[PDB]
Design a protein around this nucleic acid. Structure first.
Ligand SMILES: [Zn+2]
Ligand SMILES: [Zn+2]
Ligand SMILES: [Zn+2]
Lengths: 89, 206, 332, 66, 130, 183, 78, 59
RNA sequence: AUCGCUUCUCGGCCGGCUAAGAUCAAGUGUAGUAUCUGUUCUUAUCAGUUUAAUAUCUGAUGUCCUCUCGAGGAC
């Protein structure tokens, strides 16, 4: 019902809302923000400008990856903007 | 003059002592890893150094408890005490003292045309200091391609007990704010740091 | 036990060389690549003594290297094809006597891979879009445009993905102020895997395909395909538009072929052999690499065999239609 | 996983697994300047001709399937 | 004591500990004891409980990066072709997890596999000797 | 045939009952015997789901490493009425442990398994590592011999045991230090 | 012969030093050393089932050399 | 089982802990189960130790 | 000395009255797992599916003729 879109990673910076603000996306954790999130403008566009990567609210900050997902190199896969398995809006 | 070190093309080192009276060839130990071996060298009686066709340098030491006379695929083995990826294939390994009045050291050429050395630490102080060097340097001065240093030296095998000198020397090329601020994170001064890395090079080599 | 490592003699082996103007000077600085090392040399117009302005170690395996320029631009950047999943655009600051990291982009995983780009590297003569490619399955494109301040900004990637396709070489193509073209040597093994007989091992020719980037549609579509008669190892840009015809040279076993589109028919010439050779006749020949000599007056090419034989490659054209090709023995 | 080439599964055959590790070895050879140079030294050819023979052996290796 | 199972949650949580430890210690030369712990980790590979299987997955991934692939693969070889379907399902899942990352460094560690009639399974490049 | 398949391997012992049903035995024969690789765990074909609590009910709860034992925290940790608990909130007392920060800056620095060839499986604890030639301390005490165990004097006369044929015990065909008098 | 009867023992002995004790000779496959419930203590006599009979006849020959708590141990066929 | 094996001449070890039929383990057990002492004429580099000792007794 | 009775002595098992004095704490949902209890296959044989092998699932009870499942005859 909820899974990654995994379109090619662009240069656009990730945007998280109030709620999701502190979370590293994949590890679900708050620890050691280090690197930065990138998603395609196909996932981030228009009404998605400054949109949350998750809930669909306005982004108040930018997501940072953990060090855990860093060494395991998961941050380099397709754009980790969750799509519900209906549309994205 | 006592034992004999076999180097497999694939399964690496086989410790073989020749019993003189029985004339038998005796395999009493082997490696815990497969490694494609170019050539070997003896740091001492109980240690062996070896290079990979892929351009790795390993050092494997016997346990002091080894059984010198004996009779899955082995009985007792030897722990691997060092793994370092040069990134360049090494066709010879020779231990020697480079300069007169200098400290004994280890020598490796490579196929790329480079010649370099490995050196032991005589103190834990320079040890831990160079450790912090490598640490704050890495994140504060990443490698140029964006490739990570640690992985690149851990490339085939994870790094064990090696400090990379060529990263430590880049302290010179950083901006004065990098040089200084990092020296503060090191609680030293750029002259202190710089000369202290000149120490090892000077004392051991040119 | 612990070991501190020192280099003493840095490797003299040179894998790649690229010549561009990196200081904004009329002189040409030569950026060469030692095995793990990035290196910058300055030859002298008069004495020719080669000055080494910079030597730096990147702590990563260099894969391919290319230099480029913004259109009509004054200066030249560097593109570093690397073993990581990151392409990086570099600029050498003449003052600071060291490189700066201009752009860092992460397209995928780490280390030399089968499917991960960085292997082959090509770029447009006008420097609009740089194309990066792996050996198989992934060919990506980054579009470049200078900012409002005329400082270089990189776009978002694109995707050329074509399943089960081996890429021999990728070379930039010359189309002046057009939708850019790219020459990708390809081959398909999917014919070979499903053919238990082994027929597809033979009777399978490597497909030459020209991809067309399109700015307006902002994707990369397959456009041109011809089957290549015999397998060539690499391709060569032929400057088009104003200077010369727009096409590609193809260095193939015992042959070179100018092979181009429009109505342009292919032109083949054999690779000349030396009189009274002592080598096994069963050993053929190809070309190793080529350095194009491009002049406001004319242009030509330089080729070399295994045996070290450099030829000057020339084009005989009727307007934009090349009728034949002339190769004179140059030197060795 | 599927779209990531080299992905295995429970039904994976010998032939496919070994031809995989072959092709990956060859991409490593194309990758590392040195090891390539070692090959050129041992069997005398150009760097070029080496890489060319490898690129010929990419699809074939082990030969036909079963 | 914990990884040796009183009840599944012990194996799970302890395994998570092995994970975060395994990412944290990386590169500092402690791998030995992590190998020892990997022994006791290894039997837990088999189960259908989602949380313990995904836990064990994270575990063996961190252990992959810390120990290095060679040792992993040396535990994952025999399981690939084993007759049963279960063992193949799992060991192939593992072997994939080991395969995607560090695919570049695996080359050396594929063992020697003899060549049959129709196919040549020996890679002779590594046997070229100066 | 499972018979003749055993002639094609350097260590055919690796071939087992269900091995002959493998989709590719002509390989698995060559893998399973690979040099340093380790066997698959045995808990399958046992339907018991990898464990039961038979032997696991006689185990100790836990025992600390000696480095942590010398510290002295063990005695500090050890009860309370409810109103004493709400008094413990109103009263409250501080510093019950009162640890020495010198000591816990000392132990883990100043003071402070298995190799790769082993892997754990369900029931295995002690046995492999009491064998012919190897006994426990106390039973030495009941036996009362000062530093062969004396019925390996009769393992001289009557012969080597049928049960453990590979046997060697000290002084006879096995040319011994501490406890272990045979291997 | 697969089983033996063992008399004259001290309760500090248990099924474990019998396990260990007779496998010194040859492995005890099935051990039986009664625990008496009522007073919670052992009378000290044992029954041992082996792999096959040869183990146990050698066991008749060698077996009665064991001395449990300074004292004599009976082993005979059964 | 071990009595049948060992008395049959097929030694008792794991190696054989699979097959039942008497025949096949016989070929399996068949599957289970040279120095040069340099004579003075420089031709004895093919000559065995014991042979050259016999030529010691002859010499 | 014995039997019976008794006395003494020793040993072993071996929380007040009142109106009962008065009064009396529970969140939800999405997924998912574990652990208890209860109940079912003496089926014989073969063929197929299926399993690592089992297991499981799926189908029928030597043929022909005559007489009233049984008997006889020819195979
Ligand atoms: Zn997308
Ligand atoms: Zn949110
Ligand atoms: Zn994370």
């Amino acid at each position: 019902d909820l899974i990654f879109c995994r379109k090619q990673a662009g240069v656009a910076i990730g945007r998280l809302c109030e709620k999701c603000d502190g979370k590293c996306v994949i590890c679900d954790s708050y620890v050691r923000p280090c690197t930065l999130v990138r998603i395609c403008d196909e996932c981030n566009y228009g009404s998605y400008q400054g949109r949350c990567v998750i809930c669909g609210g306005p982004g108040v900050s930018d997501a940072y990856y953990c060090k855990e997902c860093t060494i395991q190199e998961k941050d380099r896969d397709g754009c980790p903007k969750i799509v519900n398995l209906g549309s994205s809006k | 003059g006592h034992r004999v070190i076999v180097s497999d093309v694939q399964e690496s080192f086989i410790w073989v002592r020749y019993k003189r009276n029985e004339n038998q060839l005796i395999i009493f130990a082997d490696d815990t890893y497969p490694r494609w071996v170019t050539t070997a060298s003896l740091l001492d009686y109980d240690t062996v150094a070896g290079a990979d066709k892929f351009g790795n340098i390993c050092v494997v030491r016997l346990p002091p408890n080894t059984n010198d006379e004996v009779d899955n695929g082995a009985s007792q083995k030897a722990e691997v005490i060092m793994n370092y990826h040069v990134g360049e294939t090494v066709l010879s390994l020779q231990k020697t003292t480079l300069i007169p009045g200098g400290s004994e050291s280890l020598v490796y050429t490579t196929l790329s045309g480079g010649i370099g050395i490995l050196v032991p630490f005589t103190s834990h102080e320079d040890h831990d200091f160079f450790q912090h060097v490598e640490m704050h340097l890495r994140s504060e001065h990443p490698p140029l391609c964006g490739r990570d240093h640690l992985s690149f030296r851990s490339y085939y095998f994870p790094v064990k007990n090696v400090i990379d000198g060529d990263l430590c020397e880049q302290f010179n090329s950083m901006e004065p704010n990098k040089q200084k601020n990092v020296s503060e994170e090191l609680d030293r001064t750029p002259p202190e740091v710089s000369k202290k890395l000149e120490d090892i090079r000077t004392r051991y080599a040119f | 036990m612990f070991l501190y490592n020192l280099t003493l003699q840095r490797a003299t082996g040179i894998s790649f060389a690229i010549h561009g103007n990196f200081s904004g000077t009329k002189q040409q600085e030569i950026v060469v690549s030692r095995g793990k090392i990035l290196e910058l040399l300055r030859p002298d117009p008069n004495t020719g003594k080669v000055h080494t302005l910079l030597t730096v170690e990147v702590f990563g395996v260099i894969r391919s290297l290319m230099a480029f320029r913004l259109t009509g631009g004054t200066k030249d950047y560097i593109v570093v094809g690397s073993d990581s999943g990151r392409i990086v655009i570099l600029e050498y600051q003449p003052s600071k006597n060291m490189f700066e990291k201009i752009h860092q982009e992460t397209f995928g995983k780490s280390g030399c891979r089968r499917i991960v780009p960085g292997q082959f590297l090509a770029v447009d003569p006008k420097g609009r879009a740089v194309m990066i490619s792996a050996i198989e399955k992934q060919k990506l494109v980054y579009i470049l445009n200078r900012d409002a301040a005329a400082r270089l900004t990189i776009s978002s990637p694109l995707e050329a993905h074509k399943a089960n396709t081996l890429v021999y070489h990728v070379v930039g193509v010359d189309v002046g102020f057009e939708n850019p073209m790219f020459a990708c040597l390809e081959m398909d093994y999917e014919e070979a895997d499903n053919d238990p007989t082994g027929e597809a091992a033979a009777n399978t020719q490597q497909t030459l395909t020209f991809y067309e980037l399109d700015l307006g549609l902002n994707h990369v579509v397959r456009k041109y395909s011809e089957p290549l008669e015999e397998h060539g190892n690499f391709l060569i840009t032929v400057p088009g538009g104003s200077d010369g015809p727009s096409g590609v040279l193809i260095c193939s076993e015992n042959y070179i072929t100018y092979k181009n589109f429009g109505d342009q028919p292919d032109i083949r010439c054999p690779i000349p052999r030396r009189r009274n050779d002592l080598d096994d006749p069963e050993r053929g020949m190809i070309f190793v690499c080529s350095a194009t000599h491009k002049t406001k007056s004319m242009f030509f090419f330089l080729a070399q065999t295994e045996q070290g034989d450099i030829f000057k490659i020339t084009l005989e054209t009727d307007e934009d239609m090349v009728t034949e090709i002339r190769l004179k023995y140059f030197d060795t | 996983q599927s779209k990531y080439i080299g992905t295995g599964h429970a039904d994976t055959t010998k032939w496919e697994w070994l031809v995989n590790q072959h092709r990956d070895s060859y991409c490593s050879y194309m990758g590392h300047f040195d090891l390539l140079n070692y090959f050129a030294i041992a069997e005398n050819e150009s760097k070029a001709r080496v890489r060319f023979n490898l690129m010929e052996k990419m699809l074939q290796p082990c030969g036909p399937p079963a | 004591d914990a990884l040796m199972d009183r009840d599944l949650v012990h194996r799970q949580t302890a395994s998570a500990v092995v994970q975060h430890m395994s990412l944290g210690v990386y590169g500092f030369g402690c791998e030995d004891s992590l190998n020892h712990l990997l022994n006791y980790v290894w039997p837990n590979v088999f189960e259908t409980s989602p949380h313990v299987i995904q836990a064990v997955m994270g575990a063996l991934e961190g252990l992959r990066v810390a120990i290095g692939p060679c040792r992993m693969l040396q535990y994952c070889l025999q399981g690939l072709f084993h007759p049963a379907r279960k063992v193949r399902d799992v060991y192939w899942k593992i072997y994939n997890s080991i395969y995607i990352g560090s695919q570049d460094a695996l080359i050396a560690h594929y063992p020697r596999i003899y060549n049959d009639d129709k196919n040549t399974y020996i890679r002779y490049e590594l046997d070229y000797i100066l | 045939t499972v018979a003749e398949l055993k002639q094609l391997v350097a260590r055919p012992d690796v071939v087992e009952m269900h091995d002959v049903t493998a989709q590719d035995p002509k390989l698995l024969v060559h893998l399973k015997a690979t040099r340093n690789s380790v066997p698959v765990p045995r808990h399958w074909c046992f339907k018991r789901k990898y464990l039961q609590g038979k032997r696991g009910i006689e185990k100790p709860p836990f025992e600390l490493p000696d480095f942590i034992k010398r510290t002295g925290i063990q005695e500090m940790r050890e009860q309370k009425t409810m109103k004493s608990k709400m008094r413990e909130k109103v009263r409250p007392k501080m510093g019950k442990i009162d640890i020495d920060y010198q000591k816990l800056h000392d132990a883990f620095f100043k003071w402070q398994l298995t190799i790769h060839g082993d892997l754990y499986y369900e029931g295995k604890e002690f046995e492999t590592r009491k064998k012919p030639g190897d006994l426990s301390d106390e039973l030495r005490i009941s036996l009362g011999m000062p530093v062969p165990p004396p019925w390996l004097i009769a393992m001289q006369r009557y012969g080597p045991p049928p049960s453990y044929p590979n046997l060697k015990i000290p002084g006879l065909n096995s040319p011994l230090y501490g406890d272990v008098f045979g291997t | 012969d697969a089983t033996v009867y063992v008399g004259g023992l001290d309760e500090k002995v248990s099924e474990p030093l019998l396990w260990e004790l007779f496998l010194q000779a040859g492995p005890v496959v099935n051990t039986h050393m009664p625990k008496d419930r009522v007073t919670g203590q052992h009378q000290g006599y044992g029954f041992v089932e082996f792999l096959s009979e040869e183990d146990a006849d050698y066991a008749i020959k060698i077996m009665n050399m064991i001395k449990l708590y300074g004292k004599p141990i009976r082993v005979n066929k059964a | 089982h071990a009595h049948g094996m060992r008395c049959l001449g097929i030694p008792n070890t794991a190696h054989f802990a699979n097959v039942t039929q008497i025949e096949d383990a016989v070929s399996l057990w068949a599957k289970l189960k040279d120095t040069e002492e340099e004579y003075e004429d420089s031709s004895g580099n093919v000559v065995n130790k014991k042979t050259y000792e016999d030529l010691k007794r002859q010499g």
